[PDB]
Every structure is written in structure tokens, then in C-alpha cells.
């Protein structure tokens, strides 16, 4: 069952180097290539680099030539892009994919979930967490409101889950905004039902893994 | 059916605004059919009922003689009990009066009540047999032993098994269409999702006259052990509830809302 | 002692935007017995609002319905406002039809 | 270096309609040219390679042909779930692959007003010095709402951002947030604050308030 | 028809 796992992916200043890494698994890395794709936030695809490993054959963008170095582990089956001299440019979500071993599929068939690289003069700092208490004057339409309010982050992917992910009817958990601080803060809110205010705990987990920050906070109903 | 005679007077001190409030009111059942506010114009027992308005000038000279000896005494409670707790003059305090008697079907006494509270808290009570009393801490014990010494259960007891017991008879008498009446609840169910996969049933019984009732609900064949409000009045002299249920959406059927009131010849 | 009161707010007849009813605020459970309520429409003080003579439950807490006629309609947004000393700051309860 | 150009950046259909994205090469490409759909925030999925070929396991009402130049996706019956950006790729083996900039498929559905809640900041975050009022505005098509803040009934610029959340890939709505952030100071200086929202769902605009008691 | 039995206290 092929299976591409991307890591590596992190912070690092302007002029640093990252070395992001492809897990394949249910195929040899030897026998395919290995592209890289990456994604800059609410950008288009764009490709990166492509190895064959057997013949170390290596091909790159423009944007990225003589900058990124694609190699391969066979004894890993790992597949890496080394990152240097990175610019503010080079942030995006980077894909791992591979050629499809069809030969009849002329196409990148298996993609990984992808690694967020941030390019930024560093800044590292975990989100506070504020409840959106359900409003205890009507705003009901027999169902209440209520979320948490994760606020000045940095550098990117924040997790909220509601009772360690048991509750997901109803949730919303909105895209982070860029503030004018430079920093970042995003709303999850769920719909429940107002006669489950006064039986049924609500705890939203906030997971910040770039700042070694969880934070699971209570929300009630204030008075 | 079981009927019942009541008066309630609260008295609250006003340190600063002169002299203390005093409110009476008058209930047969869940009638009321009399009043007094020392803060009204009149400075009378006000009627508050249509089947009262016949009774003559003489019953209503006596009750606003009678009303207004309670609160003349509650004006003196209100600065005793102050003494006994060593409270501020300063501080506002409560005290509280319900007596009255209960009538079977057959229209014979049945019980008797006079209870006291100062603040919100027992202070003194008639017990039961109606020779004795309850003494709730150490300032009531005082109370106690001056009431036994003045006669005073004695003497609410032939109030309570005589006089309390004729006159619920002559009210319910005079305001049969009104007293002797039971509007049986008209009762609608509202449905509103609330959720992907919830949706509330919301059971509603209104129009009723007595408050006496019950609403339970079942799944399939046993009671569902949900939401349930006070029993409100609707403010024409009949009543209103409501009891709700979130049940999981496409499963709404295999609920069902059960009334029990005096009212309906058996639960709806 | 200290008892925080319950507030129901609700029509006395099924509410029918154009018919004239009787808009009701009933607060129960509280000690001690001063209270201040107030009707609401669209956020505003309805002046002429009339309530019961105050009497009280088995448990000693207190009781008042205050009531006013009133004729609703779809966008008019009706409340009730209750003051009282276990009230760290004023309550507002919103009229919904099916409550 | 071969530049595709995805015809129409973004589009909007309802259900059961016929949807047809064309990208257009810069030099012959023969039909060396694969397509993927792309669901926000997820790794993109292989739908037709070879201009014409459906990858094995993808929906049938997915097709790709090609019009001299031109190459065409089209789903022939637009689900709610096929909500995404679709993308064409010339795909060479031996050198470098290059991507359309890609089409945005938003879902068209039945005009829905949202809900909407106001929440005040919350004790913990006042002592922080910084208070954010939020307003929601839940489940609601289609994305064009209006959201202003009245803070004492004068209308607010600038210190508000709000963020919309993805289609949903059932039921087709949005939902979205307006945060208004204030100092601790400048927010105790006033009683009442209010959003106020006008969209097509809406009658007459909508405003939820309080007052900084409660 | 109240009670005339009130003593203080």
C-alpha cells in the first residue's frame, strides 16, 4: 500500500538551511521518482525538484537551482530536499510525490500530507486561549454557542479539537489570521444544544507543537 | 377534591425609609381572594376576587382591623428578633407568617399550619397535633416559652378546627364557578432541530387551574429519567408548564410526553 | 441568606404576530424580597407594568409575576431586566415564542 | 519553460450541473497532461493523466478531452463534495513538470440566512490588557455577508479582521468570524456593543448585542 | 376571615 510520509518541515531564519525528509513505504525508492511540490499559503503548486535514485539523475525549478539539493537513502527508503540559503519566498507547504509504477499512468499518482516550512526571522511564541462563553441571555435558537479564542501565535499550524476530538458535530474551526502585530490568532466554535449547558463538560485542546504549547481549556456558560 | 385556605404576610424592615413593609394575601386553593399593602392607597383589605365583592361592610371592617393588628405586631417582631441576634439597626430583615387549614372531599377538616420565619428561616411552628411547637434555634426556644405561657396554640386551635374551616366552606360556596372549577391543561408538543443529529420535543400543558400537575416522559415503555420549569401562572387565574427532551434526530416517534391533572379523566 | 431568582419570560396565550396578549416576566426562588424588574421592547423601558402581590413557597423564597398587554410582531424584540442584591450585575432574559 | 493557463480562476454551480475547467499550453504539449483535484488544506488526488485517461477508483462524471490547443475537465453532475481546486499538469518524465495556476469549484445552493452570536471577552483575557469581542455568523450561502461593529451606536473602521471558513462538503454554507480587539482601557470606557449584520437571507439587517454588565 | 390570635414575640 504506498504511503508517503514528509517531516523536517519547521521555522528557520532568512540565509538558513532545512533538510525535509519523504518516508516511502509499500514501494522501493530505487525504482520511482521523487518529486517535490510546494505550496506558498493561498498559492498554486509549484514544482520544486525530481530524483531517480538508481541513476542519482537530479532535476530542479529555476526558482530553486543551485539553492535545494534533492538526494535519496535507499537503505532508508527516504527520499530529502536540502534546503539552502532560504529566502522569505521559499514558505509553503511542501508535497512529496512519486512517478506512478504503471508506466501507463503518465502522472504524480501517490502524494504525502505535506510539511509547512516558515521562512521568517525566527519569532517562536505559543497561542493564549480565552473561552467564548455561551451566552447566558437567549442568542438560542434552543441551540447555544460557545467556543475558544486562540490568540498571537507564531509560526503557523495551531490543532483545536473539542473533548480530545470525541465532539465534532458542529465545529468550526476558522483559518488563522495574519494580525497587524505579525502574529497569528484563529476562533473554533460548535453549536450544542442549551439544555446540554448544565449536564455536558466542553474542552477545547489547542495544540501549538512549533512552541511545545497544549493547552486544554474548560468553556462554561459565566456567572 | 382537597381544598385549602391560606394567608401569607411577609414584614421587611427599612432602616432609613420609615416605617416597615407589610403585605398580606388571602388564597383559597390557588385563588387569591384578598390583599393588604401598607404601601397602598387604601390602607384597607382590598378584595381581589369577584365571589368575595358580596360580603358586607362588617367582615370587611374586621379583616382590615385583623390585618392591621399582625402588622402593627410584626413592626415589634421585626425589632425582638434584631435584640436576640444582636443585629445592626441599619440592616434590613424579614419576616415571614403562613397559617391556614385543609378541607378533605367530604369537606371536613383535615389539617391545620401556622409558621413563622425570620431572614428566610424557620424561627417557630405549630406542630401537627397543634398543642406544641417546632423551635428551629436558641431565640425561638425564648418565643416558645412566652407563647406557651400566653395560651396562643390553644387559641389558634379553635381557629384553625372552627372559624378557618367554616369560612373555606361559605368561600367555596360563594365562588363555585370559580373554585369548584378544574380547566384540564390543553396540551401541543414543539419540535426544533438542534443539531446535526439532535432535536428538542418540547411538551407543553396550559389553561389549567389547579397547579397540581405532572409531566414525565417515556421512551418506547419506561419513564425517561431533560428540562422542566416551574409551574407558572398564566395571570387569568389558570396555569401554564413545559418539559422538554433532546432525543437523537429520526427517533422523535418512540417518545411520549405524559399529563396527569385532576382536570383529565386519565393521562393523556 | 441569599437566593438568586428564576426568571421565566413568555405570553399567556400562543403567541399570533397582530393579536393582543399579555406579555409575562414571572420571578420566583429569590430572598431576599426587593427586586427590580423591568419589561423591555426592542431594549427600551415599557412603563405601564403591572405585577402581583408578593407571596412566597414552602421554601420561603418569594414569588412576583409582572405582566403588561402587548400585540408582537416579527421584528419587535421583547426582555425582561431583573435587578436584585445576589445579582452581581443585571440580568437579561429574551422573550422566545417557543420559549 | 511550458506555462499552462487554467481558463476560469474561479467558478460557482449548482448540484447536477455540468461544469466544464480548460487549460491552455504555451507550446504543443501532445497530450501529455494530467489533472488533480485538490480539497483545501489536503495532498492533491490524480484524476485524468494522459488528457483523456480516468485515473483507476475517481468518479465517473469526472472526463478530460482535449479542443486543439485547449484541454477540458468536466464534471458532467457536480457534487457538494467535489467542492475544491482543480488543477492540469504538463507531465514530461525526463525534465520539468509545470503546473496550471489552478480552478476554485465553490458549490451554489439554496439561499440560507446565518445564526448569529456575540460573545464579550472573557475575565482571563481582561486581565491581559486586550479585549476581543467576537461575532459569528454560523452556516449561512452565500460567502457575501456585511458584519459592522457599533461600540455605544458609533459604527467601528479598522480594528476588526474577520476569517471565513472553507465550503462545507455536505451542506454547501459558510460560516464566519469578526473579532474587534480594544485595549482594556478603551473597552471600560463604554456600555453597549453590537454587530450588525445585512445579508440576502436577511430580511432587513440583523444586530446582537450587550451591555458590559450582562 | 384571618385569625385575631397574634402575640408577639
Known amino acids: 500500500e504506498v504511503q508517503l510520509v514528509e517531516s523536517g518541515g519547521g521555522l528557520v531564519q532568512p540565509g538558513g538551511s532545512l533538510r525535509l525528509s519523504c518516508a516511502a513505504s509499500?514501494?522501493?525508492?530505487?525504482?520511482?521518482?521523487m518529486h517535490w511540490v510546494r505550496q506558498a499559503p493561498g498559492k498554486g503548486l509549484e514544482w520544486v525538484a525530481k530524483?531517480?535514485?538508481?541513476?542519482?539523475?537530479?532535476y530542479y525549478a529555476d526558482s530553486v537551482k543551485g539553492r535545494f539539493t534533492i538526494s535519496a537513502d535507499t537503505s532508508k527508503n527516504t527520499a530529502y530536499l536540502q534546503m539552502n540559503s532560504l529566502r522569505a519566498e521559499d514558505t509553503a507547504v511542501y508535497y512529496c510525490?512519486?512517478?506512478?509504477?504503471?508506466?501507463?499512468?503518465?502522472?504524480?499518482?501517490?502524494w504525502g500530507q505535506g510539511t509547512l516550512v516558515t521562512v521568517s526571522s525566527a519569532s517562536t511564541k505559543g497561542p493564549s486561549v480565552f473561552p467564548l462563553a455561551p451566552s447566558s441571555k437567549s442568542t438560542s435558537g434552543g441551540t447555544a454557542a460557545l467556543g475558544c479564542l486562540v490568540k498571537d501565535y507564531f509560526p503557523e499550524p495551531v490543532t483545536v479539537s473539542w473533548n480530545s476530538g470525541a465532539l465534532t458535530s458542529g465545529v468550526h474551526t476558522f483559518p488563522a489570521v495574519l494580525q497587524s502585530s505579525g502574529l497569528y490568532s484563529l476562533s473554533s466554535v460548535v453549536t450544542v444544544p442549551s439544555s446540554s449547558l448544565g449536564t455536558q463538560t466542553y474542552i477545547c485542546n489547542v495544540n501549538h507543537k512549533p512552541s511545545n504549547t497544549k493547552v486544554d481549556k474548560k468553556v462554561e456558560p459565566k456567572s | 377534591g382537597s381544598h385549602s385556605m391560606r394567608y401569607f404576610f411577609t414584614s421587611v424592615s427599612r432602616p432609613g425609609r420609615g416605617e416597615p413593609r407589610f403585605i398580606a394575601v388571602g388564597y383559597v386553593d390557588d385563588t387569591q381572594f384578598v390583599r393588604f399593602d401598607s404601601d397602598a392607597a387604601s390602607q384597607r383589605m382590598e378584595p381581589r376576587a369577584p365571589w368575595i365583592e358580596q360580603e358586607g361592610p362588617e367582615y370587611w371592617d374586621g379583616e382590615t382591623r385583623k390585618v392591621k393588628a399582625h402588622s402593627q405586631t410584626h413592626r415589634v417582631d421585626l425589632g425582638t428578633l434584631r435584640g436576640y441576634y444582636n443585629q445592626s439597626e441599619a440592616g434590613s430583615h424579614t419576616v415571614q407568617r403562613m397559617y391556614g387549614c385543609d378541607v378533605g372531599s367530604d369537606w371536613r377538616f383535615l389539617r391545620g399550619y401556622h409558621q413563622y420565619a425570620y431572614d428566610g428561616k424557620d424561627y417557630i411552628a405549630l406542630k401537627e397535633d397543634l398543642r406544641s411547637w417546632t423551635a428551629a434555634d436558641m431565640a425561638a426556644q425564648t418565643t416558645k416559652h412566652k407563647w406557651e405561657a400566653a395560651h396562643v396554640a390553644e387559641q389558634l386551635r379553635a381557629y384553625l378546627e372552627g372559624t378557618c374551616v367554616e369560612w373555606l366552606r361559605r368561600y367555596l360556596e360563594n365562588g363555585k364557578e370559580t373554585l369548584q372549577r378544574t380547566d384540564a391543561p390543553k396540551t401541543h408538543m414543539t419540535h426544533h432541530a438542534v443539531s446535526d443529529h439532535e432535536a428538542t420535543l418540547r411538551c407543553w400543558a396550559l389553561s389549567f387551574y389547579p397547579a397540581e400537575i405532572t409531566l414525565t416522559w417515556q421512551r418506547d415503555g419506561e419513564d425517561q429519567t431533560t428540562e422542566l420549569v416551574e409551574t407558572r401562572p398564566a395571570g387569568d387565574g389558570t396555569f401554564q408548564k413545559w418539559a422538554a427532551v433532546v432525543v437523537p434526530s429520526g427517533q422523535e416517534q418512540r417518545y411520549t410526553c405524559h399529563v396527569q391533572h385532576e382536570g383529565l379523566p386519565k393521562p393523556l | 441568606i441569599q437566593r438568586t431568582p428564576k426568571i421565566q419570560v413568555y405570553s399567556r396565550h400562543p403567541a399570533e404576530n397582530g393579536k393582543s396578549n399579555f406579555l409575562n416576566c414571572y420571578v420566583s426562588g429569590f430572598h431576599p424580597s426587593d427586586i427590580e424588574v423591568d419589561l423591555l421592547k426592542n431594549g427600551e423601558r415599557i412603563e405601564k407594568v403591572e405585577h402581583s402581590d408578593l407571596s412566597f413557597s414552602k421554601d420561603w423564597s418569594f414569588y412576583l409575576l409582572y405582566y403588561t398587554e402587548f400585540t408582537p410582531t416579527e421584528k419587535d424584540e421583547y426582555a425582561c431586566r431583573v435587578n436584585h442584591v445576589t445579582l452581581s450585575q443585571p440580568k437579561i432574559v429574551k422573550w422566545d415564542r417557543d420559549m | 519553460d511550458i506555462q499552462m493557463t487554467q481558463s476560469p480562476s474561479s467558478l460557482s454551480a449548482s448540484v447536477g450541473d455540468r461544469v466544464t475547467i480548460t487549460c491552455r499550453a504555451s507550446?504543443?504539449?501532445?497530450?501529455?497532461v494530467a489533472w488533480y483535484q485538490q480539497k483545501p488544506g489536503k495532498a492533491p488526488k490524480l484524476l485524468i493523466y494522459?488528457?483523456?485517461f480516468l485515473y483507476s477508483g475517481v468518479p465517473s462524471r469526472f472526463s478530460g478531452s482535449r479542443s486543439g490547443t485547449d484541454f477540458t475537465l468536466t464534471i458532467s453532475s457536480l457534487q457538494p463534495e467535489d467542492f475544491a481546486t482543480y488543477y492540469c499538469?504538463?507531465?514530461?518524465?525526463?525534465?520539468?513538470?509545470?503546473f496550471g495556476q489552478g480552478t476554485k469549484v465553490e458549490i451554489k445552493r439554496t439561499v440560507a440566512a446565518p445564526s448569529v452570536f456575540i460573545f464579550p471577552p472573557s475575565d482571563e483575557q481582561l486581565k491581559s490588557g486586550t479585549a476581543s469581542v467576537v461575532c459569528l455568523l454560523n452556516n449561512f450561502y452565500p460567502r457575501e455577508a456585511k458584519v459592522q461593529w457599533k461600540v455605544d451606536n458609533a459604527l467601528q473602521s479598522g480594528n476588526s479582521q474577520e476569517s471565513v471558513t472553507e465550503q462545507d462538503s455536505k451542506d454547501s454554507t459558510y460560516s464566519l468570524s469578526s473579532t474587534l480587539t480594544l485595549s482594556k482601557a478603551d473597552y471600560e470606557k463604554h456600555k453597549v456593543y453590537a454587530c450588525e449584520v445585512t445579508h440576502q437571507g436577511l430580511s432587513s439587517p440583523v444586530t446582537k448585542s450587550f451591555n458590559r454588565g450582562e | 376571615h384571618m385569625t385575631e390570635v397574634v402575640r408577639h414575640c
Open positions: 510525490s512519486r512517478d506512478s509504477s504503471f508506466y501507463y499512468v503518465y502522472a504524480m499518482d501517490y
Open positions: 509499500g514501494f522501493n525508492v530505487y525504482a520511482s521518482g
Open positions: 530524483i531517480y535514485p538508481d541513476s542519482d539523475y537530479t
Open positions: 507550446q504543443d504539449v501532445n497530450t501529455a
Open positions: 494522459s488528457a483523456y
Open positions: 499538469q504538463q507531465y514530461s518524465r525526463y525534465s520539468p513538470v509545470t
